[model samples]
Target: TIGLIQKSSAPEIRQNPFNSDVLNGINQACNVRGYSTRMTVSENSGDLYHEVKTMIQSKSVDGFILLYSLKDDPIEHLLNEFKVPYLIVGKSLNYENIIHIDNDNIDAAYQLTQYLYHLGHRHILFLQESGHYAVTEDRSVGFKQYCDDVKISNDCVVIKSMNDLRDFIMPSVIITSDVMLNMQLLNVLYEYQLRIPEDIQTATFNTSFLTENATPSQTSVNINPDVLGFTAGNTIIDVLRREKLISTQIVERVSTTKIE
Candidate 1:
């Protein structure tokens, strides 16, 4: 069996459509290969570290698949010490036997930004999730590169709370790092009686019910979570079976409009 790890403090992990799809893909591939899966979630990395430590010591599962990434994370070091085989669903900071499955987040972000640019959105705000993960970092890099290439100076704000947006001047559109953060920002916009697309536009990645069913749907990159998840499960199984390896792979959805 393979142990699936999701690093999140939010209780909505199960309700997150993105997580559900990824886990489903992982489960499906593993089930076909005669393997089982167990999931572990915790409020923070600290508590998760101890829980995973116990699991490793007991030889509970063969390997692990982390749905997120952290730089120089202690849990990774512990896994290395035990000579455990693990795969990261996001970018690996720095390590050996580095196996991961992901999208070209940098290019995805760039394309999203370019799309907004062509829509005549000159002033765009990047509402980044509060973390130092590779996903956020890579997306920020892409956003920056595109803005620089076009000579549109901007800042990437790491939003810890809605209050973080209070001081900034409202831009033409707000591009969030992920769908969850985009939803949170939408609530804030509502509180201020700000109408989306009318007062300000919104966009994000990870297309799902959250993005599709928003009060006014959001524009976003598909990111192909199903593929990411399936590839994750398939690749790790290959590693465990000492077979061939797989590589990383990137898309769009609706919330913005034209200037007619």
Candidate 2:
């Protein structure tokens, strides 16, 4: 059996479409290959570490698949301590002896911003949900690079909650670091009487029902979570089989528009 570890709120682990789709992909690949899977989720990394430690000690799972990556994660270190075979499904920490599957978040963000820039959006705001995670850093780096090359002053903000919207200086277009943050931004916009594309254009990184069914259906980059999950499943299976392993589009939607 393989243990899948997700570091997120219980509701998010249970309810996020992205998570569900990824898990579906993983299940398809793993189950077809006769590898059973079990899931464990917790927002608290310390608690998560302990739970994973217990699993390792009991030798119940043959390996693990980490659904998300974090910087300096103690859980990762714990896995290493037990000499466990684990595969990360998100951005790599570049740690030694660790394998991961991920997207080119940097390029993806750059492309999304470039699209808006081509549509005559000069004042673009990049929003993030306050984290030291590599995904956020890489995306912001990409956004900043494009802004620098085009001589556009970068406007980046780390918003902690909906209340942070009050301090935001509205821009012609807003691109969130991820879909969840994008949804939060949408709710904030609703409170401010702001309309999508008309009052302010909006976009985000991940595509899901949240983005697809948004007020005006937000534009987003398809990070290919399914591909990531499937590939991760196969890669880890291959590793267990003693084989070698190692390894985005901006979908335009109603939420964005040409400047005329």
Candidate 3:
């Protein structure tokens, strides 16, 4: 009986697609593996460390599966104190007994940038919300690296919030991370009388229904959620079985495709 502990803030737990998608995959995998999973919600009201400690003390479960950003290293350090075998869904850690399943952000960003380049876009605007996660850093790096590799002007603009929206009108493409932020940015763009895919093209990671409902139908990177979850589940099972030494650098890169 392996125990799974999901650590996330309250609002994020409700709004984040990554959390839901990964949990779904883990639940499905557990069903197939015949293991009972206990879910602990570490919202704003609860302490993440205490939640993990309580789960460890329960002794009803064998190990843990942590679904969190690697940038949140405090959780990782706590898991180390328990000397437990666990797997992380995002962000790699330099610790034993922790496996990471992540997407190839560099390739995905390169593909997106190439697609926009082919569409005759220069001056691309990269938008990201406030977050210090590995996914954000990797995606940003991939975007910049691709731009450099292609010898683009490197005219990239990043806006942290909607308040910072004053800019010159130019032929550009806007690439963003989450759909909610994309919508907010799009609204601001509209206020400036800019049309999507006409005045400025748009693309994002983590496809969503909101993007589909947009006027021009945004282009996005289709990160297969089910596949990510399945991989995470398999890694957890492998760690619990103690079949191999849990190496710190187990990176599983999932394939992503460009969606127009």
Supply candidate 1's per-residue lDDT for 14: 57
What C-alpha root-mean-square deviation, in Å, does candidate 3 show against the real structure?
Answer: 5.9
Regarding TM-score, does 1 or 3 come out ahead?
Answer: 1
After TM-score superposition, what is the CA distance of residue 149 in candidate 2 from its true location, in Å?
Answer: 1.0
Largest lDDT belongs to which candidate?
2
lDDT by residue for model 1 over 1-260, one digit each (tens)?
A: 89887886476545677788888889889989999997876778898898888889888899999888888888888888888989898887768558878777888889889988998988888988888888889999999999999998677888876666554434788899987778888888887788878888888888888888886888778877777788889888887962122222223334688643
Q: How would you order the candidates by TM-score, starting with the best? A: 2, 1, 3
Judging by TM-score, tell me the better candidate of 1 and 2. Answer: 2
Which stretch of 10 consecutive residues in model 1 shows the poorest summed lDDT?
Answer: 242-251
**lDDT score, candidate 3, position 175:** 79
Clashing pairs in 2: none
Maximum-TM-score candidate = 2
Q: Please, what are the lDDT tens digits per residue for candidate 3 over residues 1-260? A: 66656655566345766567767887888889888787666764247777777777777678777665656467677778878787766667457545777777666767777777776676676776566667766677778888898787655555655677545325467777666667776788788877665566777777656556665576777776666777778777876762222111111111112223
What TM-score does candidate 2 get on C-alpha atoms?
0.93
Each model's TM-score, in the order given?
0.91, 0.93, 0.81
Better of 2 and 3 by TM-score: 2
The C-alpha RMSD of each candidate to the native structure, in angstroms, is 2.8, 2.4, 5.9
For candidate 1, the lDDT comes to 0.81
By summed lDDT, the worst window of 10 consecutive residues in model 3 runs over: 246-255
